[PDB]
Design an enzyme around this catalytic site. Structure first.
Site, PDB file in Angstrom:
ATOM      1  N   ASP A  34       0.801  -1.215   0.000  1.00  0.00           N
ATOM      2  CA  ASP A  34       0.000   0.000   0.000  1.00  0.00           C
ATOM      3  C   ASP A  34       0.836   1.268   0.000  1.00  0.00           C
ATOM      4  O   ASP A  34       0.280   2.356  -0.170  1.00  0.00           O
ATOM      5  CB  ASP A  34      -0.923   0.015   1.217  1.00  0.00           C
ATOM      6  CG  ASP A  34      -1.930  -1.108   1.197  1.00  0.00           C
ATOM      7  OD1 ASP A  34      -2.467  -1.404   0.113  1.00  0.00           O
ATOM      8  OD2 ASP A  34      -2.192  -1.691   2.267  1.00  0.00           O
ATOM      9  N   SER A  53       2.478   6.801   0.677  1.00  0.00           N
ATOM     10  CA  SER A  53       1.572   5.941   1.426  1.00  0.00           C
ATOM     11  C   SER A  53       0.168   6.156   0.890  1.00  0.00           C
ATOM     12  O   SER A  53      -0.390   7.248   1.033  1.00  0.00           O
ATOM     13  CB  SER A  53       1.625   6.240   2.922  1.00  0.00           C
ATOM     14  OG  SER A  53       0.549   5.616   3.594  1.00  0.00           O
ATOM     15  N   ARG A  54      -0.402   5.118   0.280  1.00  0.00           N
ATOM     16  CA  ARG A  54      -1.695   5.252  -0.371  1.00  0.00           C
ATOM     17  C   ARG A  54      -2.842   5.381   0.620  1.00  0.00           C
ATOM     18  O   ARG A  54      -3.913   5.862   0.240  1.00  0.00           O
ATOM     19  CB  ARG A  54      -1.939   4.061  -1.294  1.00  0.00           C
ATOM     20  CG  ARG A  54      -0.911   3.938  -2.401  1.00  0.00           C
ATOM     21  CD  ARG A  54      -1.073   2.650  -3.180  1.00  0.00           C
ATOM     22  NE  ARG A  54      -2.374   2.567  -3.829  1.00  0.00           N
ATOM     23  CZ  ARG A  54      -2.640   3.040  -5.040  1.00  0.00           C
ATOM     24  NH1 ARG A  54      -1.717   3.649  -5.764  1.00  0.00           N
ATOM     25  NH2 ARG A  54      -3.865   2.897  -5.534  1.00  0.00           N
ATOM     26  N   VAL A  55      -2.653   4.963   1.870  1.00  0.00           N
ATOM     27  CA  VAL A  55      -3.687   5.177   2.876  1.00  0.00           C
ATOM     28  C   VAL A  55      -3.783   6.655   3.227  1.00  0.00           C
ATOM     29  O   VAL A  55      -4.880   7.193   3.418  1.00  0.00           O
ATOM     30  CB  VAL A  55      -3.410   4.314   4.118  1.00  0.00           C
ATOM     31  CG1 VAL A  55      -4.489   4.526   5.154  1.00  0.00           C
ATOM     32  CG2 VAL A  55      -3.329   2.855   3.732  1.00  0.00           C
ATOM     33  N   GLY A  56      -2.643   7.332   3.324  1.00  0.00           N
ATOM     34  CA  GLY A  56      -2.652   8.776   3.471  1.00  0.00           C
ATOM     35  C   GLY A  56      -3.180   9.222   4.817  1.00  0.00           C
ATOM     36  O   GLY A  56      -3.025   8.543   5.837  1.00  0.00           O
TER      37      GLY A  56
END
Ligand SMILES: Nc1ncnc2c1ncn2[C@@H]1O[C@H](COP(=O)(O)OP(=O)(O)OP(=O)(O)O)[C@@H](O)[C@H]1O
Ligand SMILES: [Mg+2]
Lengths: 333, 464, 50, 514, 464, 50
Positions: D344, D369-372
């Site tokens: 992710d 970080s794709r969750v952010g």
């Protein structure tokens, strides 16, 4: 606190290693106890009887070759109805002769084995090169074999050789010596298992087949104790190995012999040659377990500490006191 | 009649059948794993005929626990997926099993995922622009009806919001549907997409088909075909224009490469399967317009090593008609849908397919934006006051143009309430003609944010 | 920290000695019960009293 | 000591009974280089656990019509042709339970730290299904790594799969050990909703390095909630292949029981190498870099166990921190590409940044970080919002460091701010910062309170200021921790204390900072 | 029940045994070559059981002259080497046969070359610095007493010179026992080491085991294990601190690769054997030091193609505490010992072990050198005059630091003529703190070349 | 035991016979020289590399 845990873990390590040593000493003492106890004959017989009481409570051919061999076996079954003892012997000899011819003439075997659907050309080559030299029954089966397609060329040989064996086995069926021939085959199998030099000498197919057959006769089958059917089967095998093991081949031949009669061989290892009572009990219990008649073959193994072990098919039933002792030893916490 | 497993080497399973019953290629066979912990029904896809009645299959499910000699039953048809109005609003795997409602769709009409592309005489000889209604797409990089669009982007650049926007626009403006082919989904990303679409209430207009990453490469390779088969049913049977998303079609290529390696085929140039171009063609050629209805596809593409000459992107781009690139820089400037007007491109932005006025206005906008992008360095280092008067005028005009490329997307209606705008293409063309000529350079920049068309521009200007 | 490490090291060795011996003591009782434990194990494996 | 020295053995002898069960036997026909081919075993199942005579174990991995090629799990030299192989009717399984906390276990769950046995609560098969799409939940809870760079720029939310990727000796194991250490404050709360249980899976590391990591965790107090699934380089290729799955199973047992887990794979490159060795020894067809076709699957099947479960399943989560060694910073290699695709987000550690003194050496910008922000508390989200843009502008402006007189006022201010932010993200090893301290530290830089401190002193100015706030104005930290946001009154108090501290701060150059 | 050679292919020999007498793996078998010119007793090592009572073996002596069908007798145990204090002061080969005195240890205690690594319970990290006297090593790559040390390098960058210098700096005063394993290195340098040790009276405390590159793959595989067996005996059965020099440990993996394809293994990346990591891991883990029993091992590692991304050095890196890394780039610039200060590393270089002053100076030196490496691209084209004043000063600092890391080592007297020098760690830290801080910017850079110390710096500056 | 790495670039520059002084080396070194040559050219290779 880390030092306290360190001393606690040292105490636990001491406990564990002392327990390991105690367990090792205990099972070593138990090993001595059982070794003393097993040596008795009545005790050993009682142990095997207890094992039987416990028991009371319980193909390498690929698809095309497999189906072709099944068809050839069916054809042999059809033909054998009108065969005779001398006729069966002649059929076996001629099938072995064609097996030898196919092995020698590699090109001949390869075209008689091609997977072509057209059977006419093949059969034409067949008769052309062998029609007047062999009987009729032989050719009938010896052609059925050629007509069917085979996964590999060698399989065709394995087909005819297979029939060559059945011809002899049927002969044993004609004379009623199935038990005698099976017993002699297993005796020869265990003999060839020992003295592997003889097995290697018989295995070599580079040397002429006649020499190997003569060696076998001088060593194994040239004495009055060899049954005629068993001797013929051994001679045919020795003539048609093609790199297979001699002991391997003969035990497979015995397995085929029992299989022809619907039974399955169960190799049994025991500390001593048990009497007939528990032998017939073992046969009955094994047949009940596997739902098929079984022929038990014994092997001397005093190292089993008075226990009994069975292996049939890919399955084993191990109650050897040596194996149980080993399990106890390795099971120590 | 039923086969027997004779070899198991990871995903590859060899099955021996009776001589008269060997299944034909790509048939789906069922095997049973009876081990309690791993109990399953493996779907094996026949990939090769080895001879002696053996067939080599790629297991669509993990083969752990499979036993030699287990009965393998041939279904008689290739991997079939449920098709119908019922697939809308539900998530499926590559094999047509519903994930959010197990047992759903098992009684629908089922279609094989291996279907030939349209006959040559049935293809549309003329490219037709897809007026999606977004100003940026319709002006700078017009989409192609029945074509493929690369969607470059990432996290926090509004890719999911743009996907929702295009789902809404295909469902409302064209009366069509969408099929989201999640090739190589991160299960977390797939779940996030499912919940986002459900919350946005656009799930009812989209059929999700997720081939997760945790599955063996067979399903990751066949999920694109499954989703495209649902899209084909919508196009040919229901008579609807469809929008087939494929995130990410590099995965599809890499799943094909892994399947090729497993079957033992010698690798091609960069380790890709020898039939890379043919697999990609067999997938992409089915995405086309036929008999008046079209399957458009926005296909996110990964470019390995950022090398557009790599075999995978090179084969993918032979089929891509447009290229929308979402930018973090544009996103941070408040300019949703976050499309970069300069990095994005289209192969229909030609004077011939689009009107000459359209091409002229688009080229003028591109020129202005490029000049502004060049001046960005001077502005950031030397300050705005170090430019010339002509440069400052162009900077103001470019600011207003790039902010007017933003739009109040339908996907944003769930957050603000303001209905999304569907700007007609002619209105966008004339509006940007006015912008590039300076007719609106006296309005404040905030007036151009998130507004569709000149009417909205005037109303927002009066509201400031 | 150095003083704690030194005192813990001294305690450990003291404990290593005490353990060692404690173990020898127990080793004895161990050799006393080995006979009975081995007899029980032999009876178990044989399936009958030894 | 006690009578147990005998009693335990007694309990064995009284309880032991080797009964006579039927067993299918194979025979070893080939054996070499860690692979043994076993003729027979008709009913063996793929990935079964075969047992060889000398107590050796193998995994039935290739099944043909002729033989079963099994990868041997250690003690390979004791395998010979003709040996009897018994099949255990169980696919690869490992024991799992709370007893694994503070233990070092080999990929089969057997302890190797020399302490007592492990009381297993249950067993889990290594190849169980990962949570399905319907069974998961959005990643929304932070997993504070304690590294300002990661927690500010590429936040890791529990349920995420963050890849620490970089060349050798760049700070990866340091980052993950710091992350494990940072969970002690959560552990001491006693609240399972906060507690994070750690599983450090060491693959292919030397025994002394695993010992060093265990020492770093013990001296940091982290060993009371961390298990180390160790497959040292001495261990067979099978153990290096299985260790991530062992660790994932131990973590999954907790995860499905409502706990939160943190799994560190170090490294997955050696996992891939061991799998490649096994595959090539079994004659599975090779592909790019000789890896088998399903190597991606090997990693995917693993990393997709790391998920956040829905509230129906207890809401537990397992966070993945795979570590990958990139050769010559080539993130385009096969395994790096695969795991970058799977995960992710990525903390890219670079040796150039490490040597510049930017250690912990996360290349911000390239790192993502794709969750952010969903993985950040509101305080960090608001405070660290401008940090990324500031650092990007600084990297753009770095070429102008020599001409600060000729730049615009805003550009020079951005350059000065960026240098201090870069100094701010630096952090000493084995010293993770609580989230409140990170919030205050990033607040110092983003809000401009470091703009007066010299660059070379920023690291000290932060370190002292927090040391002051903790000791004297803990109300700020308590507010940030208990409320998760930096309230306006708390912000004013923080600014006042920063200004008061500024007067008493002695810059290393002798100048005054006010 | 003796075997029989069936198949000979270079170093690999297949032997068929009777069914009940197939030797266990790693057993030593004895064939006999009777041809007069090459007559010998050929020691094979069972490497694979291949079925049908065949085993495949790696020959230790060359197979030239071996005849098919020759009797092969099984020793019943793995290759055994002599162990004890008797081995000290003598030269052995892989098979344990003494060279300088044939038949010497035939009656000593013999240990198998194959044994499991020490259990994880007995391993603790080592954090005691070993002062070598080399400025670069003592400053930037401090060696660990009882730890694992490596001297990576390309071909002909000075690995043998530096390992000989380390023998001169560590072993000459060492109170314990030294073991030198020449694993596939050059025989000339082995003899040079032998005579050097004899002249310095260190031979009486050193055991040399040579498997030099003239030997076939079998010896180049098993000689490292043969020497490590003596090292392990000294570690375990005597408790003496042990030095274990190996040159070159790459030859172990290279010999494994050489026999890999003849053993039937499919080649891995770059043509290495699939078992590269496991094979090297066993050997490396046997070298560790267990608590209370120290082995200070130094391993010269060869990097093929000067490529540090090659699988062999890359896999070896994980096994080492300190890793000096010689580079041809530094060697070309005349710097000897040719260490790359940036690529090299050490685990004991933490402020908690070497102290804050040492750590600060080392990290400042590395910072300056990294900035210089980044600037070298600019300087070669835009010129030094276009750098910032601070960067220009840093470049002048960095050139002097690079040249000061050079040192006149004792083992390199025949490379430079001048005698060697030893620099205390305190003096190194002080000198580099002065450099990095500027106290020597006025001295010419050539004054810092091959000097070794501050007094030598002053003398050479005055001579300039 | 050494290299004489002859370089085409140096060869064209007129440096014949083309020994790249930096890469080239002889690890026997001064031991393979007469004492006069060793004394006169002790550091010549390193001086030329620098
Ligand atoms: N933030 C930091 N500040 C200072 N030193 C650090 C920091 N992080 C790591 N180091 C040091 O850098 C070196 C490398 O650390 P570490 O062991 O974590 O590296 P790694 O990337 O895991 O590499 P390896 O492949 O050797 O395991 C060690 O000396 C460690 O002490
Ligand atoms: Mg590490």
């Amino acid at each position: 606190a880390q030092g306290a845990q360190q001393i606690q873990l040292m105490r636990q390590q001491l406990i564990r290693q002392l327990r390991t040593g105690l367990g090792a000493e205990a099972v070593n003492k138990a090993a001595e106890i059982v070794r003393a106890h097993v040596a008795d004959p009545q005790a050993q017989s009682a142990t095997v009887d207890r094992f039987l009481s416990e028991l009371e409570q319980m193909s390498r051919l690929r698809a095309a070759s497999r189906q072709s061999l099944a068809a050839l076996v069916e054809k042999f079954d059809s033909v054998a109805g009108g065969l005779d003892a001398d006729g069966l012997t002649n059929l076996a000899d001629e099938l072995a002769s064609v097996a030898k011819l196919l092995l020698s003439e590699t090109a001949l075997n390869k075209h008689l084995a091609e997977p072509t659907d057209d059977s006419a050309p093949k059969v034409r080559l067949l008769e052309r090169l062998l029609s007047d030299k062999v009987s009729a029954t032989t050719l009938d089966l010896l052609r059925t074999a050629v007509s069917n397609r085979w996964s590999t060329e060698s399989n065709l040989i394995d087909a005819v050789e297979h029939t060559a064996r059945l011809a002899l086995l049927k002969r044993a069926e004609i004379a009623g010596e199935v038990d005698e021939v099976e017993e002699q085959l297993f005796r020869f199998g265990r003999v060839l298992d020992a003295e592997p030099r003889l097995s290697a000498l018989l295995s070599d197919y580079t040397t002429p087949a006649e020499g190997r057959v003569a060696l076998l006769d001088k060593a194994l089958t040239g004495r009055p104790g060899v049954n005629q059917t068993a001797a013929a089967l051994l001679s045919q095998t020795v003539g048609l190995l093609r790199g297979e093991r001699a002991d391997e081949a003969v035990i497979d031949l015995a397995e085929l012999a029992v299989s022809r009669r619907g039974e399955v061989v169960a190799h049994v290892s025991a500390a001593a040659e048990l009497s007939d009572a528990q032998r017939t009990r073992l046969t009955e219990v094994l047949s009940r377990i596997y739902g098929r008649p079984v022929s038990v073959q014994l092997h001397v193994d005093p190292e089993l500490l008075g226990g009994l072990s069975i292996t049939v098919g890919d399955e084993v039933i191990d109650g050897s006191i040596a194996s149980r002792l080993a399990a106890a030893q390795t099971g120590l916490p | 009649t039923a086969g027997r497993v004779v070899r198991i080497t990871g995903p590859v399973v060899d099955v021996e059948f009776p001589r008269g019953s060997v299944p034909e290629l790509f048939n789906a066979l069922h095997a049973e794993i009876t081990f309690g912990a791993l109990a399953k029904t493996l779907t094996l896809e026949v990939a090769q005929h080895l001879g002696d009645s053996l067939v080599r299959c790629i297991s669509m499910q993990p083969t752990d626990g499979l036993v030699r000699g287990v009965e393998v039953t041939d279904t008689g048809a290739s991997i079939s997926v449920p098709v119908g109005d019922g697939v809308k609003g539900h998530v499926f795997n590559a094999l047509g099993d519903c994930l959010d409602d197990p047992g759903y769709g098992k009684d629908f009409e089922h279609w094989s995922i291996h279907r030939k592309p349209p006959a040559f005489s049935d293809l549309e000889p003329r490219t037709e622009m897809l007026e999606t209604g977004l100003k940026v797409v319709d002006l700078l990089t017009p989409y192609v009806r029945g074509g493929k669009i690369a969607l470059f982007g990432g996290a926090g650049v509004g890719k999911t919001v743009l996907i929702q926007e295009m789902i809404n626009r295909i469902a409302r403006n064209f009366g069509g549907t969408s099929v989201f082919a999640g090739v190589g989904e991160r299960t977390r990303e797939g779940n996030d997409l499912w919940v986002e679409l459900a919350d946005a209430n656009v799930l009812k207009d989209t059929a999700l088909v997720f081939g997760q990453m945790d599955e063996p490469p067979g399903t990751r390779m066949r999920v694109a075909l499954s989703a495209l088969t649902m899209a084909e049913f919508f196009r040919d049977e229901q008579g609807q224009d469809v929008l087939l998303f494929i995130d990410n079609i590099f995965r599809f290529t890499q799943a094909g490469s892994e399947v090729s390696t497993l079957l033992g085929r010698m690798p091609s140039a960069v380790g890709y399967q020898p039939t890379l171009a043919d697999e990609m063609g067999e997938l992409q050629e089915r995405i086309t317009s036929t008999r008046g209805r079209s399957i458009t596809s926005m296909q996110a593409v990964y470019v390995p090593a950022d090398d557009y000459t790599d075999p995978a992107p090179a084969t993918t781009f032979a089929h891509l008609d447009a290229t929308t690139e979402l930018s973090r820089a544009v996103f941070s400037k408040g300019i949703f849908p976050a499309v970069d007007p300069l990095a994005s491109s289209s192969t229909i932005l030609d004077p011939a397919i689009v009107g000459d006025e359209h091409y002229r206005v688009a080229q003028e906008v591109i020129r202005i934006l490029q000049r502004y992008k060049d001046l960005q360095d001077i502005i950031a280092i030397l300050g705005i006051d170090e430019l010339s008067e002509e440069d400052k005028q162009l900077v103001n005009r470019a600011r207003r143009i790039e902010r007017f490329l933003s739009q109040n997307m339908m996907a944003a209606e769930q957050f603000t309430g303001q209905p999304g705008s569907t700007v007609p293409l002619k209105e966008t063309i004339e509006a940007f003609d006015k912008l590039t000529k300076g007719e609106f350079d006296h309005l404040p920049e905030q007036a151009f944010f998130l507004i569709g068309g000149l009417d909205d521009l005037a109303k927002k200007a009066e509201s400031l | 920290r150095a003083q704690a490490s030194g005192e813990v090291a001294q305690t450990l060795t003291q404990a290593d000695q005490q353990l060692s011996a404690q173990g020898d003591q127990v080793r004895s009782g161990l050799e006393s019960s080995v006979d009975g434990l081995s007899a029980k194990l032999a009876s178990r494996i044989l399936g009958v009293d030894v | 000591s006690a009578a147990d020295i005998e009693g335990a053995i007694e309990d064995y002898v009284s309880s032991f009974s080797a009964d006579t069960e039927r067993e299918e036997i194979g025979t070893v026909i080939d054996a070499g280089d860690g692979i043994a081919h076993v003729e027979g075993l008709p009913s063996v199942m793929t990935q079964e656990l075969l047992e060889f005579p000398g107590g050796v174990l193998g995994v039935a991995l290739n099944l043909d019509e002729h033989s079963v090629g099994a990868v041997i799990l250690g003690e390979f030299e004791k395998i010979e042709e003709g040996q009897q192989v018994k099949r255990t009717g169980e696919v690869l399984s490992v024991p799992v339970g709370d007893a694994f906390l503070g233990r070092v276990v080999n990929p089969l769950g057997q302890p190797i730290d020399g302490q007592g046995d492990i009381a297993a609560e249950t067993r889990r098969a290594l190849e169980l299904q990962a949570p399905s799409v319907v069974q998961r939940q959005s990643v929304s809870e932070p997993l504070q790594t304690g590294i300002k760079a990661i927690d500010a720029m590429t936040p890791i939310g529990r349920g995420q799969r963050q890849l620490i990727i970089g060349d050798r000796k760049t700070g990866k194991t340091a980052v993950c050990v710091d992350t494990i250490l940072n969970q002690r404050e959560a552990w001491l709360t006693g609240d399972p909703k906060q507690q994070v249980r750690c599983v450090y899976v060491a693959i292919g590391q030397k025994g002394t390095t695993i010992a060093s990591v265990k020492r770093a965790l013990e001296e940091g107090g982290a060993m009371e909630y961390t298990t180390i699934v160790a497959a040292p380089a001495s261990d067979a290729a099978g153990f290096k292949w299985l260790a991530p799955y062992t660790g994932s199973a131990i973590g999954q047992h907790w995860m499905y029981n409502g706990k939160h887990v943190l799994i560190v794979f170090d490294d997955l490159s050696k996992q891939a190498d061991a799998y490649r060795a096994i595959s090539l020894l079994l004659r599975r067809p090779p592909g790019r870099e000789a890896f088998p076709g399903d190597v991606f699957y090997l990693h995917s099947r693993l990393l997709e166990r790391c998920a956040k479960l829905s509230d129906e399943l207890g809401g537990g989560s397992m966070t993945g921190l795979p570590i990958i060694e990139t050769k010559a910073n080539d993130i385009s290699a096969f395994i790096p590409t695969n795991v970058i695709s799977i995960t992710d987000g990525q903390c890219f550690l670079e040796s150039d940044l490490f040597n510049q003194g930017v250690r912990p050496a996360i290349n911000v910008g390239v790192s993502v970080s794709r969750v952010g922000g969903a993985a950040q508390i509101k305080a960090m989200k608001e405070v660290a919002g401008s940090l990324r843009l500031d650092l990007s502008q600084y990297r753009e402006l770095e070429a102008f460091a020599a001409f600060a007189s000729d730049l615009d006022a805003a550009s020079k201010a951005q350059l000065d701010r960026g240098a201090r932010l870069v100094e701010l993200l630096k952090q000493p090893q084995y010293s993770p910062l609580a989230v409140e301290e990170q919030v205050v530290a990033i607040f110092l830089g983003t809000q401009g309170h470091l703009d007066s401190v010299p660059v070379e002193d920023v690291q000290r100015f932060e370190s002292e200021l927090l040391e002051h706030v903790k000791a004297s104005h803990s109300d700020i930290f308590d507010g940030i921790r208990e409320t998760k946001k930096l309230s306006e009154e708390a912000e004013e108090k923080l600014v006042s204390v920063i200004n008061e501290f500024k007067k008493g701060f002695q810059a290393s150059d002798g100048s005054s900072v006010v």
